[PDB]
């Protein structure tokens, strides 16, 4: 559905001993709207431009619409995010089911 084009750092070749990727320049290609736009990346990492671009991690969420650059030390294991999303959806569904009872608004969620 979407194709991401990540520009290399300083247009270096893959065989270069110091290779990197530039996440600030990513072009998405939509298939439903026949459009090719840019990615509104949100760089949240201490260091600025002086920080070497070898410790980074682009996290993509919300159906390929949210981009965040974070260091590779604070990453999340797959089970963690799976459990997070499952817990959020399950809590939303549980609050929906219970909202239709007369004893609501006087209850507590333990």
């Amino acid at each position: 559905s979407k194709v991401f084009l990540t520009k290399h750092y300083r247009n270096r070749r893959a065989g270069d001993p110091e290779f990197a990727l530039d996440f600030e320049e990513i072009y998405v290609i939509d298939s439903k709207t026949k459009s090719i736009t840019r990615a509104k990346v949100v760089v949240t990492v201490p260091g600025g431009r002086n920080r070497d671009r070898k410790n980074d991690l682009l996290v993509i969420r919300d159906n390929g619409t949210s981009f965040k650059i974070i260091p590779s030390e604070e990453r999340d294991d797959p089970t963690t995010v799976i459990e997070k999303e499952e817990w959020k959806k399950s809590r939303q569904d549980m609050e929906r089911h219970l909202r239709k009872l007369r004893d609501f608004s006087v209850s507590n969620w333990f």
Partner: protein, 50 residues
Amino acid sequence: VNIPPKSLLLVQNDQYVESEQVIAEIRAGISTLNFKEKVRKHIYSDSDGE
């Protein structure tokens, strides 16, 4: 919520209602099969008199 062709609203304006209470009836606007059967129920007097 409401249904346009046939809605029978059993409630009044500014009326406090609780959950799972019947508010309207769709009235099953779709026509029922026309097999009309007419039956005769008899009222029985409970006490004696005129």
